[PDB]
C-alpha cells in the first residue's frame, strides 16, 4: 500500500538522509552538504538562488534554528513547506478565475 502523501514524505526523508548519513552526525547536514542537496535536488525550484552562493548560505543560516551550523531534518522540512507553498502560489499567480485552475508551478 502506502499512500501518495506517505510516498511523497518518504522521498523528502530519503533525499535528506542520503546526504546527512555520510559524515559527522548522521541525521544532520553541514553547509557543503546542504549546498549540494540544493544544487542537485532543487536545481529547478531554486534555480536563481543557486546562482548566488551567499543567498544559499543565508537560506541555510535562516533555517538553522539552534544556530549550530548544521541542518536537522526538523529545520530542513520548513524549507520543503516554503517551496511547496511557493510552487502553489506560482500555480495561481495572477489568477483571475472563475473556478479552479493551476498554471505551471516552480521551475516551470
Amino acid at each position: 500500500k502506502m499512500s501518495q502523501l506517505e510516498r511523497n514524505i518518504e522521498t523528502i526523508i530519503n533525499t535528506f538522509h542520503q546526504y546527512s548519513v555520510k559524515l559527522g552526525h548522521p541525521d544532520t547536514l553541514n553547509q557543503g552538504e546542504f549546498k549540494e542537496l540544493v544544487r542537485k535536488d532543487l536545481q529547478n525550484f531554486l534555480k536563481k538562488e543557486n546562482k548566488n552562493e551567499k543567498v544559499i548560505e543565508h537560506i541555510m543560516e535562516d533555517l538553522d534554528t539552534n544556530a549550530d551550523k548544521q541542518l536537522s531534518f526538523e529545520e530542513f522540512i520548513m524549507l520543503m513547506a516554503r517551496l511547496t507553498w511557493a510552487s502553489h502560489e506560482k500555480m495561481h499567480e495572477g489568477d483571475e478565475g472563475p473556478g479552479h485552475h493551476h498554471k505551471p508551478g516552480l521551475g516551470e
Binding site: 499512500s3 501518495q4 502523501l5 506517505e6 510516498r7 511523497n8 514524505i9 518518504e10 522521498t11 523528502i12 526523508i13 533525499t15 535528506f16 538522509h17 541525521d27 542537485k40 535536488d41 532543487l42 536545481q43 529547478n44 525550484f45 531534518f73 526538523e74 522540512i77 520548513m78 520543503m80 513547506a81 517551496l83 511547496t84 507553498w85 510552487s87 502553489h88 500555480m91 473556478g99 479552479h100 493551476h102 508551478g105 516552480l106 521551475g107 516551470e108
Partner: protein, 88 residues
C-alpha cells in the same frame, strides 16, 4: 524535467486538491473532507489522534476549513513524525 524531490513537493499539492476540490471553496478542506484525507493518506499513528482533534489543530483561524497553508502544518507534522520513526 523536475527532480524526484521537486516532483514530491508538487505531488503534495495534488494530494491536497483531491480533497479540497470535492465541494465548496476550492482551497477549503472541510471537517468531513479531512476525515477522508486522513483515512486515505495518513498512517495509523497519525489517524490515531482522531479526525476531529486534527481538524481543531489545523483550522488555525477557526473558519471551518483547512486551507492549503493550514494543510502544510499537517504535512510538516507527518514529515517530522515519519523521520522520527524511520530512525528506530
Amino acid at each position: 524535467m523536475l527532480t524526484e524531490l521537486e516532483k514530491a513537493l508538487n505531488s503534495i499539492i495534488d494530494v491536497y486538491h483531491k480533497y479540497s476540490l470535492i465541494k465548496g471553496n476550492f482551497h477549503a478542506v472541510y471537517r468531513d473532507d479531512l476525515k477522508k484525507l486522513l483515512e486515505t493518506e495518513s498512517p495509523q499513528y497519525i489517524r490515531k489522534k482522531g479526525a476531529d482533534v486534527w481538524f481543531k489543530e489545523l483550522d488555525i483561524n477557526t473558519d471551518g476549513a483547512v486551507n492549503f497553508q493550514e494543510f502544510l502544518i499537517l504535512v510538516i507534522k507527518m514529515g517530522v513524525a515519519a523521520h522520527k520513526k524511520s530512525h528506530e
